[PDB]
From a paper:
Crystallization trials of highly monodisperse preparations of the IL-23:MA12 complex yielded two distinct crystal forms that allowed us to determine crystal structures at 1.74 and 3.4 Å resolution, providing the opportunity to visualize the binding epitope in detail and to cross-validate structural observations. MA12 folds into a left-handed triple-helix coiled-coil structure, with the binding surface located mainly at the C-terminal half of helices A and C. In agreement with the ITC-derived stoichiometry of the complex, one copy of MA12 binds to the p19 subunit of IL-23 and is oriented parallel to the longitudinal axis of the p40 subunit. The respective binding interfaces feature 20 amino-acid residues contributed by MA12 and 28 amino-acid residues contributed by p19, burying a total surface area of 800 and 840 Å2, respectively. Five hydrogen bonds and two salt bridges are formed upon binding, while the rest of the interaction interface can be described in terms of van der Waals contacts. The binding interface is further hallmarked at its two ends by two prominent attachment points. At the other end, Tyr110 on MA12, a conserved residue in all matured binders, inserts into a pocket on IL-23 p19 defined by the BC and AB loops and the N-terminal part of helix D. Furthermore, we note that this segment of the AB loop in the p19 subunit of IL-23 is disordered in all currently available crystal structures of IL-23, suggesting that the interaction with the Alphabody induces the observed conformation. We were intrigued by persisting residual difference electron density emanating from the Cδ1 position of Trp319 in IL-23 p40 up to the last rounds of refinement. Indeed, mass spectrometry on tryptic peptides of our recombinant human IL-23 confirmed that Trp319 in the p40 subunit of IL-23 is mannosylated.
Numbering used by the authors:
A (entry chain C): 2 to 28, 46 to 72, 86 to 118
B (entry chain B): 27 to 141, 150 to 189
C (entry chain A): 23 to 279, 284 to 328
């Protein structure tokens, strides 16, 4: 997958988690969920350095795509927790 | 034609819920090149639909028909698999309350009026942000129409 | 190579050290067929003869004004500018990244109302040899007319030990519908030329999303005798869309000089409790859609 596409996916993920973060302000542990959100944002920053650089090593493209998918699943789990809390 | 102050109250509530029911993104976020075609299939209160103050003074029925159509459209969208599918929102969720408020207003306008989809959960979620910010734009125009009618058209 | 405007051309280049660049063929815009020569900028060195000139464009020394002549008279001119692509990305040297609301935000636009008029701003460190050109439309595939004025200096300030120049431009949609629900965004397109370097920039938005009302007008305080209670009053700003019965505003009233003593109202008056050295401040937002709050209007307490 292109670097342009990967940066688009990262931008979307940054927008969604920023929005979830703001939504939590407007409202089973909130402090815990906010820490998980911040940790994802933190990992996005570390991943961005892997991108702008283009038994142990750094990340390939495929490995970046796999981590993005994993981050999306973590965001979906958080989103589902929050939606259940406000319902 | 019909209960201006009642429509004002309900359309104001719709604006509040459209913004509070669900997380938001920035207006420059989640934009893409194909959005021009996607926008075309959604109904809008367009130039010339009669919802400007002068058109409302002349004959508000044109505007209110367009508002009713848009409300019916967004009710169908908010009740579709985009919102009920994985990650699922329940009918009693804030988005479910927003859906019920669309229905309440459309019923007030025409009591006897009668009432595409992605498969991946991440894509459903993205589309929810896009649909709801479109809805925010629509219900803001509707709320101005009813506020102005209540202020200037109520005998 | 493509034509930016009459007799002005842009050559796109993959830009890296010792890059070979692009071969271009310039044609003298003339009926003549014999006795033609070419030069560049001020030098009289004849670079070539004939109706056409083939040149290798790979650095700024190859850009500039190419002139063809016959019989000592100038026949035509061709100005070549370079558009650098650095590692697959077009250069953005000329404008400063404002990094808000996101990375690569070079243009910022605001509207005071729904009239279809708006203003855009950008920042640069460059002081000389600098030209901007602004165009706008509503929609990209089927563009609807927007008329823009000239971009000109609006402020000069010092930031990080160097001058920062702010430019602004005013634009007006030709056939605006203040009350309608926009379905196609405004596009703003800015050409920037610094010497022989060409860049361009874009912003896309709905007017409703860049709304920022002017501050409340005529903010006044009426103190109550023997109390710190005060009646606050104000008016809608002159520039806001009319009629106000349609384009309603909402307001935030704050008393401050640590905490946040705020109330929200749709009226143009409120009752609050003042204290010394504190100010009463009021700001405004579109009642029905969450765009930007106005700047504060403020009056001191007492
Ligand atoms: C911001 O900056 C960018 C990057 O520099 C500009 O993008 C360039 O825009 C120009 C002008 O539109 C483009 O040049 C034009 O391209 C047209 C399409 O060319 C493609 O397709 C042909 C096949 O038909 C290919 O051969 C070609 O290589 C391209 O792949 C052409 O039709 C245009 O030709 C014009 O001139 C000839 C004679 O010279 C006429 O016969 C034609 O009828 C026509 O009038 C022209 O070449 C250029 O391709 C863009 N670059 C990229 C990378 O996309 C943006 O335009 C600029 N933004 C603004 C607002 O100016
Ligand atoms: Na820059
Ligand atoms: Na007093």
């Amino acid at each position: 997958m292109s670097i342009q596409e990967i940066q688009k996916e990262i931008a979307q993920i940054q927008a969604v988690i920023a929005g979830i973060q703001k939504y939590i302000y407007t409202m089973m542990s909130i402090e815990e969920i906010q820490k998980q959100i911040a940790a994802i944002q933190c990992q996005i920053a570390a991943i961005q350095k892997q991108i702008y650089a283009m038994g142990g090593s750094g990340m390939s493209i495929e490995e970046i795509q796999k981590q993005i998918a994993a981050i999306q699943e973590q965001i979906l789990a958080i989103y589902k927790q929050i939606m259940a809390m406000v319902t | 034609s019909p209960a201006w102050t009642q429509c004002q109250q309900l359309s104001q509530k719709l604006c509040t819920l459209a913004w509070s029911a669900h997380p938001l993104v920035g207006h420059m976020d989640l934009r893409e090149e194909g959005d021009e075609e996607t926008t075309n299939d959604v109904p809008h209160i367009q130039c010339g639909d009669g919802c400007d103050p002068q058109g409302l003074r002349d004959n508000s029925q044109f505007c209110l028909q367009r508002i009713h159509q848009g409300l019916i459209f967004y009710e169908k969208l908010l009740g579709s698999d985009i919102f009920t599918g994985e990650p699922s929102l329940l009918p009693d969720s804030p988005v479910g309350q927003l859906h019920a408020s669309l229905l309440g207003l459309s019923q007030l306008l025409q009591p006897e009026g009668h009432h595409l989809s992605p498969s991946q959960p991440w894509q459903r979620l993205l589309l929810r942000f896009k649909i709801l910010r479109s809805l925010q734009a629509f219900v803001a125009v509707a709320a101005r129409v009813f506020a102005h009618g209540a202020a200037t058209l109520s005998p | 190579i493509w034509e930016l405007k009459k007799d002005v051309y842009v050559v796109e280049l993959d830009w890296y050290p010792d890059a070979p660049g692009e071969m271009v063929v310039l044609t003298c815009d003339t009926p003549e067929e014999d006795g033609i020569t070419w030069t560049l900028d001020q030098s009289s060195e004849v670079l070539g003869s004939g109706k056409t000139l083939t040149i290798q464009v790979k650095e700024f020394g190859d850009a500039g004004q190419y002139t063809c002549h016959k019989g000592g008279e100038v026949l035509s001119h061709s100005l070549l500018l370079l558009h650098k692509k650095e590692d697959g990305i077009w250069s953005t040297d000329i404008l400063k990244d404002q990094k808000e609301p996101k990375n690569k935000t070079f243009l910022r636009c605001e509207a005071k109302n729904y009239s279809g008029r708006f203003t855009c701003w950008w920042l640069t460190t460059i002081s000389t040899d600098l030209t901007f050109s602004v165009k706008s439309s509503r929609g990209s595939s089927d563009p609807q007319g927007v008329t823009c004025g000239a971009a000109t200096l609006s402020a000069e300030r010092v930031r990080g030990d160097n001058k920062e120049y702010e430019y602004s431009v005013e634009c007006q949609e030709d056939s605006a519908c203040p009350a309608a629900e926009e379905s196609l965004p405004i596009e703003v397109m800015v050409d920037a030329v610094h010497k022989l370097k060409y860049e361009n920039y874009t912003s896309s938005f709905f007017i409703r999303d860049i709304i920022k009302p002017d501050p409340p007008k005529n903010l006044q305080l009426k103190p109550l005798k023997n109390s710190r209670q005060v009646e606050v009053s104000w008016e809608y700003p002159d520039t806001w869309s009319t009629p106000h019965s349609y384009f309603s505003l909402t307001f935030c009233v704050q008393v401050q000089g640590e905490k946040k003593d705020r109330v929200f109202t749709d009226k143009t008056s409120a009752t609050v409790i003042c204290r010394k050295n504190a100010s009463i401040s009021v700001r405004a937002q579109d009642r029905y859609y969450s765009s930007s709050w106005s700047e504060w209007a403020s009056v001191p307490c007492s």
